[PDB]
Amino acid sequence: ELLDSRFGAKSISTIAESKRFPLHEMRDDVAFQIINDELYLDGNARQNLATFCQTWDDENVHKLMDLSINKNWIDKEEYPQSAAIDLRCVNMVADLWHAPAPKNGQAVGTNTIGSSEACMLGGMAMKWRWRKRMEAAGKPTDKPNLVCGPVQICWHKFARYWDVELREIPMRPGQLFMDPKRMIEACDENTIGVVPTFGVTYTGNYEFPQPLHDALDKFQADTGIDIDMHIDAASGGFLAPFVAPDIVWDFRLPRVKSISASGHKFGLAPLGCGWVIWRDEEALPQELVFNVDYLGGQIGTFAINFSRPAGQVIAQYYEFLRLGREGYTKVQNASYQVAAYLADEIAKLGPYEFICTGRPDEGIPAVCFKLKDGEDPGYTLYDLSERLRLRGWQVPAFTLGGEATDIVVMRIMCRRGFEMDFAELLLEDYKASLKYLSDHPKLQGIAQQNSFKHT
Amino acid sequence: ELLDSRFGAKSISTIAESKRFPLHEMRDDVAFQIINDELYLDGNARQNLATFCQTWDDENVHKLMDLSINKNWIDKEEYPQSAAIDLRCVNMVADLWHAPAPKNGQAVGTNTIGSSEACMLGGMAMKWRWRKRMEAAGKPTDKPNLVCGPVQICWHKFARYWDVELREIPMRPGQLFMDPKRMIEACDENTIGVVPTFGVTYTGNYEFPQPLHDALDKFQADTGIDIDMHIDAASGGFLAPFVAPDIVWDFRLPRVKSISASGHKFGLAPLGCGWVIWRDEEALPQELVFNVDYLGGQIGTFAINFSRPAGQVIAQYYEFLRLGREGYTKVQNASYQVAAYLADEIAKLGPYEFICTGRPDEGIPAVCFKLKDGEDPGYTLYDLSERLRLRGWQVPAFTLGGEATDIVVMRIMCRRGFEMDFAELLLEDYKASLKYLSDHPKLQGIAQQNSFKHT
Amino acid sequence: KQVTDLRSELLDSRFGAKSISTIAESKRFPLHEMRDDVAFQIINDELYLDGNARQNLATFCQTWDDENVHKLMDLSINKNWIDKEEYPQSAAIDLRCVNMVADLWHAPAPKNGQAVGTNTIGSSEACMLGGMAMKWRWRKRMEAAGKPTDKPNLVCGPVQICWHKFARYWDVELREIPMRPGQLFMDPKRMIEACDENTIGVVPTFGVTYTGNYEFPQPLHDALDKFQADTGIDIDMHIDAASGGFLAPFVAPDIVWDFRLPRVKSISASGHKFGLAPLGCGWVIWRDEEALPQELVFNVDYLGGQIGTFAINFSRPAGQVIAQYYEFLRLGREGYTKVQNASYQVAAYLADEIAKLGPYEFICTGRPDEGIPAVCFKLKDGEDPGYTLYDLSERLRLRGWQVPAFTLGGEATDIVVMRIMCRRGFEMDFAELLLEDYKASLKYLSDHPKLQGIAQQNSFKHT
Amino acid sequence: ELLDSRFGAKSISTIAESKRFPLHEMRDDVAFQIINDELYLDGNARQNLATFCQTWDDENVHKLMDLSINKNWIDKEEYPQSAAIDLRCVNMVADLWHAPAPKNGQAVGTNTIGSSEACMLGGMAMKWRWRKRMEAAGKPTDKPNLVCGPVQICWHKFARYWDVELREIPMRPGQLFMDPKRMIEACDENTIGVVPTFGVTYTGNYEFPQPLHDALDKFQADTGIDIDMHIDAASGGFLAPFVAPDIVWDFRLPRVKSISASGHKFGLAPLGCGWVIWRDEEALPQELVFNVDYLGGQIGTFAINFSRPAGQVIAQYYEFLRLGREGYTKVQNASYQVAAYLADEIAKLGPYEFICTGRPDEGIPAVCFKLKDGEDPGYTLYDLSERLRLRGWQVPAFTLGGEATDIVVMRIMCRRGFEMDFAELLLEDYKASLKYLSDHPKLQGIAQQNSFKHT
Ligand SMILES: *Cc1c(COP(=O)(O)O)cnc(C)c1O
Ligand SMILES: *Cc1c(COP(=O)(O)O)cnc(C)c1O
Ligand SMILES: *Cc1c(COP(=O)(O)O)cnc(C)c1O
Ligand SMILES: *Cc1c(COP(=O)(O)O)cnc(C)c1O
């Protein structure tokens, strides 16, 4: 019966006998080749403008990852040097965010797999601080709520997974984020804390912690209710410090007790890297820290994951070391330049409304636009997305949350390796698409599938 | 002024300015070299018998991991084929654990970073399942407890972070594990479930689910109280199915609603891979599952992390494809023969009483022993542990938990790579140590430091 | 009543097939073939048992990996050094090194364009070549004089073991000036005493293996000149510059030790020590044509005329010469100075810092004008700080560091020293880490008094 | 002014500033490329039929040699595993040559850089053995001699360096080797030993040690004088034990007290590896062995070299383990079948007389032939040799020593990698050279340069 043209031998079908555990062994390199070949069906992401996550390859990151394939992060004993490098990073990130100079030399924070993990960790201490304070006073502590904006999905999880009532201030037309006013309306003694999104996923815009900080101070005076903040700087955290160092959002704000960020977003780390830093020893409840015994003393951890590769910490460190402040500033500005240029060029092409023009002071390096209300140029942005996909380009169109469920937007993400010249290409394909849509009016209204929007 | 003999130029110390974010850029290949050089301080782990995790390099895994560096586990859209390989592995693991053949062709479960995340996930599902049952019966739900043996630390965490009373049945002399009787005294209507550890971290013994299962059956008959189980098969999950298949521990038992294991332990997968499988649709409360829109429809995920590499999943598949049931049976067998050899040989070298002798029907491939009571051979197992460390071997000695807190043990872990030849090297260095310790009596009692134990 | 499913043969977990032991029948020559990749993987796997040497502070030899050196070595795996015909370009490179090394040591300008000297495997080969050369030069001078040649002797200081061998193998009587407290080196006075009409030569060691100090050839050279005026005995030197040989000419070029001294007839050194050559490279250079007795040089025929060799080894790889040429070429005078300086800066820092932590007396504080980049110290006399240097070495080993504590020779058999060697790739950052581990160790020994005096094994001291 | 076309920079010449030590730095890659480029002027040896040494590249060997570039043979302490391997080899080789089973489980021998060092060692042991014995009898030990045959240059070296009178028995027409009768005549009380060369460099025939052994037995019966042997098995050492094991040449013969061989000749190791084995303990004088101290005991070495790579020993081991007896037999026979084929075919091409035709029982895989006396086919072997070179082939013609100064031979060496297909091509170029010389009668007797002949 069946032969394979690669091997010149009897066929082994990954798609049959994929319902059960395999019975027999297979020659090693044959297994390797079968799998390798089917990976060619994966995209490479170079033409993907939806994703936040690092997609550019650096030959040096590959080597570091490869050496670190078995280095256990949780094993501080066998891999003391990796452990050291980790602790360094914790500090360097702490510093980048203006955390108070730490007491003994070592800042209160931890590496994580991503911002998802950093956030629940952020959330758990937030809930714990609120709880303790609340038992102290002698009041019920069974109904905690969290106040926030158009948060990324992980916050919704935390909410459910931790039994916290989520008051997400709903998106609405010409009022897309958490403003002072609607925040204060959602706060009372049962609020564990307020979570501004420093770099909203859906739109790219910054939520500005400073106006929000003011309203929480006035709140305290008025009601004697003290409220903390946690900044989800999933992408913000490695942009602002460099391209807008005078946006005050970080630890410079006394209410911020912790900040998290994805290193594998604008932090230039490979996939698998996240950070969270607490203001000081006191932001982090001791009941959450578990001290594990090892050979030269005992290190306490607050983390969900246990064993895992230390590869990404080493990489993150390598980016940190090679670039520095000076170097990050050049990288991030390169991207803002591309975003900005795309924003200026895309306005010329249709009747668009910009939620985000890719400006260092308003948000991350991303262009995000919607069709001007009740204007009809002969196509939806879904339709336009589709023509562009026929050109290799993943540019997502979708609907926003809240009360702006109505609105369809397009969002372009300018990450590292999307240089000016590709930008150029995109625009040539972008125009080609308008022209084709123009010449075939029947193409209007047909596509309607929301794309992957969450990272 | 300071210079470096690698680079014959101005010194760049990573230990100076290691507390703040660096200002200036560095040549990319110097930064790489600086970090590469400092990783040689890390152990290669080949002589470490403390860890459970994979440390054997295989060129084909290295290659797969390297291709997979930017592949996003959470992005089913752009990496449609990794998405596929992940779904197969879920299926294949379900099968391995005797999951009821899945109704629509896809088993209920999910990849994870490790058992840590897989156990919380399972724990969460326990807590919700129980809640929903009490609510229905109109009863209070404020005091949930979990009943278990000498569990790996990850469970202490679960209890803490999710407000569950952990009834850890205490280790005691001649009574090291969770027995049916002590298990029953700890149970009540608030018990969200029982967790046997099918491969105890501290000693290597299996807690056999079957006797405990009987006890719960009798308990339900007596009280009306229906208690579920989740098996912590961290190591046991990829051992018994192959070398001891008629130990009845898995979904063959009606109460076991979910199983978890480490891919990076005896799963043979590289660091950062774990599995959890649920019996059927009803073991997973829907409220826990979050739906993400993409282009080809929408997928539901129950998972703490978000973005993270697909490398591991793919490597874990390669393992499955290349080995099969046949393959793994031989691989696990090889380990068991070594531990057995070691336990049989070591029993001759001193007054030792074994808690674990590395037999496939008792536990994982590990040797675990303590000094006989009232016998004094002229050294403690800490003393021996240090002599060994001088000849490169990491053979941990530590003390047990609960009421066994008195007991010092030494535990030798046998994993892939640790072949009979090396076990021979180890025996020689063992004997040489016993001899030096014998000629140098003064050394007795000096070392007293607990080694990293939890994995 | 059973539950397992087991196979009745030893299995390997790597290959999922029958076990094959390296330990069983490693006592006879193997009978059967094995799959190549399996043989490779078995051997490679048991090489992870070797140290990587990065925290070895005992050894002199080069241990830092450079990607370019790996590639030259790999290209040269089959390049036979002795085959001047097939590898003529390897042959010219080798010649270029000899010239360069002569220039570096102030050998008088070669009359025909080529210096007198040869590459070797290491200093060992070099010194015996040097010693045969010395022995023969003497021999001839005495038969001319019609005096007996059957009782030769050699006069030197605390030499490296290789001179003990030379002396044994070649029936030369060894007059080793013994070591002794506050006089650890072959001084003018004592040298003179051992010398008579049977002394083939004097061997000063430019950079001592045991401590790291230079014996300074100049003062010994003056003693010898004075010795000739008195007795009429004309005595030659050969300098064992095993490590000094690539240090001083860059960081202390006014220390006069080389061919600027007329009694120096040959110098040897190890390329794979401070030469920055990978393992397997040495050099001996002769002052000139007359320094090398014609009877030692064997003339081999090859296609483009005939070359003469003075070597113990024959067939062997040109990998190291090529690599050592690369070093020479990329670094140059400008560069070696920098590289070498870096290392001296590490020794100097280690010494200044280590002094602060206990009752030590330093034999060698790693200073460009006194010796190589090495710290050597002993415990002060009649002082007990609560450990011996042996014990400290053992706690230190427990953190990965191999820092040798051993006894010295001659009459300082009584004295125990610790010796740190700073070589390329042991940078200031590491030094730091060592220090932190050294303090830790002190603190551990302090809290554990019973530990004192138990350890007494000598470490490998010889390179 | 002057520029380099490779780097579009100022020229840097290696033939200029290569009279004195360079003054300046140079970029690391530029140096690399400069040297690397000139190495293409070196030949690859694939077409060189002069050399005995290993020239065939195997990918597995490259990798091991590259792992061991820093691994110090003399540093038993830092590289314990290499030390173990090195020792295994001494045993394996010992076994191979039928040494008596060693007392304490470790044969008396050592790895060397080559046969040359290996003979020097054997050499000194011979002189010492004789010195000791003669002192014991109260006799003069100032006039030692060595009896031997057409030795390789290392013995001429040994005789000079260590003041021994070399009594070489000279080759002469019709008798090219040390025979029993001329052996006996050169022997006396001052003979430190006899050295038969087990595979003569200049012709490829074996000197057969047995009928010499007889002569030494008969000699001792008559005179009372006892003479020992050392076999120079540079090449034959790793041929005979596989293709012709009942040639009695090794430790079977009681008077053999040491044997030496080149690994990098027929023992298949890369350049830089030799072996010398002693019959037992007593074969090796204790004054020759130096005892270094190290941390886990003390090892006595006997060797001229100190620090050097262990790369080749590890390589040599790899060749032993992967090939075994069965493998080597196959390997070497293939070399002989080429040799045997060349001899038969060359024969058909003109008026030659053979000294050696590549038979397993007479010598090594080598063809060696001279012109028939008083015949003139129209060229000298020197002239043939030159044409052969124009077609890329190194095939040495040269004269023999002593009394055969009159005889010019060609010697073809058949080593691993010179397979049947290349034999064929050689012939096709041999045939054409002969036709050219035929057509150009003027070329005759012009060339007259001896080739490198010594290995
Ligand atoms: C992408 C995103 C996340 C998810 O973070 P991961 O690193 O992908 O786990 C969380 N918060 C925000 C604001 C995001 O944009
Ligand atoms: C090691 C271990 C764990 C932790 O697993 P990771 O895969 O390292 O997250 C959990 N449970 C048990 C029983 C273990 O042995
Ligand atoms: C290292 C050393 C030697 C031996 O050199 P090798 O190249 O290792 O043979 C000789 N003399 C001195 C002074 C040494 O330090
Ligand atoms: C080449 C050769 C030698 C020399 O040994 P090397 O391995 O080249 O150092 C000695 N004897 C014979 C017969 C040889 O052919």
Which residue among C61, C62, C124 is best mutated to probe the pocket of ligand 3, counting the most ligand atoms within 8 A of its Cβ? Answer: C124
* Ordered DSSP codes for C412-428: GGG-EEEEEE--TT--H
- CB B81, CB B315: distance < 8 Å: no
Select the residue from B4, B5, B40, B422 to test the C interface by mutation, using most C Cβ atoms within 10 A.
Answer: B5
- CB C289, CB C111: distance < 8 Å: yes
- CB C331, CB B3: distance < 8 Å: no
Whole-number Å distance between alpha carbons of A200 and A178: 11
DSSP D8: T
Q: How many other C-beta atoms lie within 10 A of the C-beta of residue B391?
A: 17
- D140-to-B12, D125, D130, D131, D136 alpha-carbon distances in Å: 68, 18, 11, 9, 10
Whole-number Å distance between alpha carbons of B313 and B311: 6
Exposed/middle/buried for residue A5 (C-beta within 10 Å: 0-12, 13-18, 19+): exposed
Q: How many other C-beta atoms lie within 10 A of the C-beta of residue B221?
A: 9
- CB D113, CB C121: distance < 8 Å: yes
Residue D25 with chain B: CB contacts under 8 Å: 8
DSSP A198: B
Alpha carbon D42 to its chain's center = 22
Q: Helix crossing, D311-347 with C36-45: angle to 10°?
A: 160
Cα-Cα end-to-end distance for chain C = 61
Name, in order, each residue with C-beta under 8 angstroms of D315's C-beta and a sequence gap of 6 or more: D61, D64, D65, D269, D270, D273
- C176-to-C228, C364, C403 alpha-carbon distances in Å: 21, 21, 27
Which residue among B51, B154, B202 is best mutated to probe the pocket of ligand 2, counting the most ligand atoms within 8 A of its Cβ? Answer: B154
**Which CATH code is given to the segment(s) A1-54?**
4.10.280.50
Q: How many other C-beta atoms lie within 10 A of the C-beta of residue A416?
A: 16
Whole-number Å distance between alpha carbons of C48 and C41: 11
The answer to whether the annotation marks B51 as part of a ligand binding site is yes
* Strands in D119-273 per DSSP E: 145-148, 165-168, 191-195, 229-232, 256-262
DSSP D394: B
3-state secondary structure chain B: CCEECCCCEECCCCCCCCCCCCCCCCCHHHHHHHHHHHHCCCCCCCCECCCCCCCCCCHHHHHHHHHHHHCECCCCCCCHHHHHHHHHHHHHHHHHCCCCCCCCCCCEEEEECCHHHHHHHHHHHHHHHHHHHHHHCCCCCCCCEEEECCCCCHHHHHHHHCCCEEEECCCECCECCCCHHHHHHCCCCCEEEEECEECCCCCCEECCHHHHHHHHHHHHHHHCCCCCEEEECCCHHHCHHHHCCCCCCCCCCCCEEEEEEECCCCCCCCCCCEEEEECCHHHCCHHHCEEEEECCEEEEECCCCCCCECHHHHHHHHHHHHHHHHHHHHHHHHHHHHHHHHHHHHCCCCCEEEEEECCCCCECCEEEEEECCCCCCCCCHHHHHHHHHCCCCECCEEECCCCCCCCEEEEEECCCCCCHHHHHHHHHHHHHHHHHHHHCHHHCCCCCCCCCCCC
Q: State the pairing for strand pair A352-357/A366-371.
A: antiparallel
Q: How many other C-beta atoms lie within 10 A of the C-beta of residue C8?
A: 4
Instruction: Find where tokens 């491969």 sit.
Output: B199
H or E element at residue C131: helix C123-144
Tokens of C118: 């040869």
Using alpha carbons, select from C2, C7, C16 the residue that is nearest to residue B245: C2
> Could you tell me which residues are beta bridge partners of residue B262?
B274
Q: Between chains, do B95 and A124 touch, taking CB under 8 Å as contact?
A: no
The answer to whether the annotation marks C238 as part of a ligand binding site is no
> Could you tell me which residues are beta bridge partners of residue C319?
none
- CB A184, CB A147: distance < 8 Å: no
DSSP D45: S
- CB B51, CB B396: distance < 8 Å: no
Considering CB atoms only, which of B29, B67, B452 is closest to A77?
B452
A220: alpha, beta or left? (left if phi > 0; alpha if psi -120 to 50): alpha
- CB D116, CB D274: distance < 8 Å: yes
Half-sphere exposure (CA, 13 Å, Cβ side) for C346?
A: 32
Half-sphere exposure (CA, 13 Å, Cβ side) for A211?
A: 10
Closest chain B C-alpha to C102 CA, distance in angstroms: 24
Q: State the pairing for strand pair A274-278/A290-294.
A: unpaired
Handedness of CA D246, D249, D252, D254 (dihedral sign): positive
Half-sphere exposure (CA, 13 Å, Cβ side) for B404?
A: 21
- A428-to-A350, A381, A388, A433 alpha-carbon distances in Å: 14, 17, 10, 9
Select the residue from B78, B151, B277 to test the A interface by mutation, using most A Cβ atoms within 10 A.
Answer: B78
Name, in order, each residue with C-beta under 8 angstroms of B235's C-beta and a sequence gap of 6 or more: B52, B198, B199, B261, B262, B265, B266, B364
Half-sphere exposure (CA, 13 Å, Cβ side) for A55?
A: 23
> Could you tell me which residues are beta bridge partners of residue A421?
none
Whole-number Å distance between alpha carbons of D267 and D283: 24
| Nearest residue in C to D327, CA atom | C33
Q: Between chains, do D66 and C70 touch, taking CB under 8 Å as contact?
A: yes
The answer to whether the annotation marks D82 as part of a ligand binding site is no
Q: How many other C-beta atoms lie within 10 A of the C-beta of residue A38?
A: 16
* Ordered DSSP codes for C28-82: S---S---HHHHHHHHHHTTTTS---TTB-S--S-----HHHHHHHHHTTT-BTT
H or E element at residue D154: helix D154-161
- C250-to-A191, A197, A322, D23 alpha-carbon distances in Å: 71, 60, 32, 11
Closest chain C C-alpha to B323 CA, distance in angstroms: 8
Ligand 4 centroid, distance to D411 Cα (angstroms): 16
User: Given 3.40.640.10, 3.90.1150.10, 3.90.1280.10, 3.40.50.300, which CATH number is that of C63-356?
Assistant: 3.40.640.10
Exposed/middle/buried for residue A154 (C-beta within 10 Å: 0-12, 13-18, 19+): buried
DSSP D12: -
| Nearest residue in D to C162, CA atom | D306
- CB D299, CB D291: distance < 8 Å: yes
Residue B68 with chain A: CB contacts under 8 Å: 39
Tokens of B283: 């073991």
- CB D286, CB D301: distance < 8 Å: no
- CB A24, CB B326: distance < 8 Å: yes
Stated resolution in angstroms: 3.0
- CB D217, CB D180: distance < 8 Å: no
Considering CB atoms only, which of D31, D48, D455 is closest to C329?
D31
Name, in order, each residue with C-beta under 8 angstroms of B305's C-beta and a sequence gap of 6 or more: A113, A114, A116, A117, A305, B112, B113, B117
- CB B259, CB B384: distance < 8 Å: no
Whole-number Å distance between alpha carbons of A428 and B296: 27
Ligand 2 centroid, distance to D395 Cα (angstroms): 67
Name, in order, each residue with C-beta under 8 angstroms of D342's C-beta and a sequence gap of 6 or more: D358, D367, D412, D414, D423, D426, D427
Q: How many other C-beta atoms lie within 10 A of the C-beta of residue C410?
A: 14
Q: Between chains, do C272 and D307 touch, taking CB under 8 Å as contact?
A: yes
H or E element at residue C300: strand C298-302
Q: Between chains, do B70 and A53 touch, taking CB under 8 Å as contact?
A: yes
DSSP A424: H
User: Based on C-alpha coordinates, what's the Rg of chain B?
Assistant: 24
H or E element at residue A62: helix A59-67
Q: Would you identify the CATH topology of the domain B349-455?
A: Aspartate Aminotransferase, domain 1 (3.90.1150)
Handedness of CA C71, C75, C77, C80 (dihedral sign): negative
Tokens of A222: 């008025």
For residues C200-224, b (16+ Cβ closer than 10 Å) or e, as one string? bbbbbbbbbbbbbbbbbbeebbebb
Tokens of C16: 């999922």
Whole-number Å distance between alpha carbons of B413 and C204: 54
Handedness of CA B287, B293, B299, B302 (dihedral sign): negative
Q: Helix crossing, C67-75 with D59-67: angle to 10°?
A: 140
- CB C407, CB C416: distance < 8 Å: yes
DSSP C432: H
H or E element at residue A422: helix A420-439
- Reduce the DSSP state of residue C17 to 3 states and report it: strand
Q: State the pairing for strand pair C17-18/C11-12.
A: antiparallel
Which chains contact D through at least 3 pairs of Cβ atoms less than 8 Å apart? B, C
- C147-to-A434, C14, C133, C139, C231 alpha-carbon distances in Å: 109, 71, 19, 9, 16
- CB B318, CB B61: distance < 8 Å: yes
DSSP D360: T
Q: Which CATH class is domain D55-348?
A: alpha beta
Name, in order, each residue with C-beta under 8 angstroms of A425's C-beta and a sequence gap of 6 or more: none
Q: Which CATH class is domain C1-62?
A: few secondary structures
Question: What phi, psi does D275 have (nearest 5°)?
Answer: -135, 135
Tokens of B322: 């290349």
Whole-number Å distance between alpha carbons of B193 and B148: 9
Using alpha carbons, select from A385, A379, A372, A367 the residue that is nearest to residue A430: A385
- A1-to-A5, A6, A11, A12, A16 alpha-carbon distances in Å: 13, 16, 8, 11, 15
What are the boundaries of each domain within chain B? 1-54, 55-348, 349-455
Cα-Cα end-to-end distance for chain D = 46
- CB A452, CB B293: distance < 8 Å: yes
Tokens of D67: 């792992």
Using alpha carbons, select from A84, D175, D153 the residue that is nearest to residue B35: A84
DSSP A410: E
Ligand 4 centroid, distance to C94 Cα (angstroms): 22
Alpha carbon B443 to its chain's center = 34
Instruction: Find where tokens 């074969």 sit.
Output: D283
Half-sphere exposure (CA, 13 Å, Cβ side) for D379?
A: 25
Looking at chain C, the residues that come just before a C–N gap of over 2.5 A are none
Select the residue from C38, C272, C279, C334 to test the D interface by mutation, using most D Cβ atoms within 10 A.
Answer: C279
Cα-Cα end-to-end distance for chain B = 46
Using alpha carbons, select from C86, C84, C307 the residue that is nearest to residue D49: C86
Name, in order, each residue with C-beta under 8 angstroms of D352's C-beta and a sequence gap of 6 or more: D346, D369, D370, D371, D372
Instruction: Find where tokens 């002396």 sit.
Output: C167
CA angle C266, C269, C270 (to 5 degrees): 155
| Nearest residue in C to D97, CA atom | C29
Q: Between chains, do C11 and B337 touch, taking CB under 8 Å as contact?
A: yes
Q: Which CATH class is domain C357-463?
A: alpha beta
Residue D86 with chain C: CB contacts under 8 Å: none
Using alpha carbons, select from B415, B327, C14 the residue that is nearest to residue A31: B327
The answer to whether the annotation marks A72 as part of a ligand binding site is yes
Q: State the pairing for strand pair A165-168/A145-148.
A: parallel
Whole-number Å distance between alpha carbons of C216 and A285: 66
Whole-number Å distance between alpha carbons of C178 and C190: 10
Whole-number Å distance between alpha carbons of D357 and D345: 11
H or E element at residue D37: helix D28-39
- CB C368, CB C344: distance < 8 Å: yes
DSSP D50: S
Q: Between chains, do C342 and B8 touch, taking CB under 8 Å as contact?
A: yes
Tokens of D264: 């990098």
- Reduce the DSSP state of residue A272 to 3 states and report it: coil
> Could you tell me which residues are beta bridge partners of residue A262?
A274
Question: What phi, psi does B289 have (nearest 5°)?
Answer: -85, 130
Whole-number Å distance between alpha carbons of C237 and C156: 10
| Interchain contact C/B (3 or more Cβ pairs less than 8 Å) | yes
